């Protein structure tokens, strides 16, 4: 099998710990963590210019993953799309490593 989660996947990081980690980084650095306020969701924490913002990973009954309109077969394909299409609709923010 594959076992190992992707490098940016940190199941047990709280929203606050994700903020503290990402405030040290540039725009677009990000992590994926299991959700706190909704057990059973995942969240994506992303450095913006002045703070860290959070996105809810959406799903449908076919198992697709999405944030907005475009849908993906996997979390990895979602993350990949947001490297070159802005994950923010108010400012331009691209996921980066």
């Amino acid at each position: 099998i594959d076992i190992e989660f992707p490098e940016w996947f940190h199941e047990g990081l709280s929203r606050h710990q994700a903020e503290n980690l990402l405030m040290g980084k540039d725009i677009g650095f990000f992590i994926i963590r299991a959700s706190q306020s909704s057990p059973g969701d995942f969240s994506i924490s992303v450095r913006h210019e002045d703070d860290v913002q959070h996105f809810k990973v959406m799903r449908d009954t076919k198992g697709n993953y999405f944030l907005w309109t475009e849908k993906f077969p996997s979390l990895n394909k979602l993350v990949d799309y947001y490297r070159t299409t802005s994950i923010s609709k108010q400012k331009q923010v691209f996921l980066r490593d």
Partner: peptide, 6 residues
């Protein structure tokens, strides 16, 4: 809690 896309 708030999320951008919710």
């Amino acid at each position: 809690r708030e999320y951008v896309n919710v």
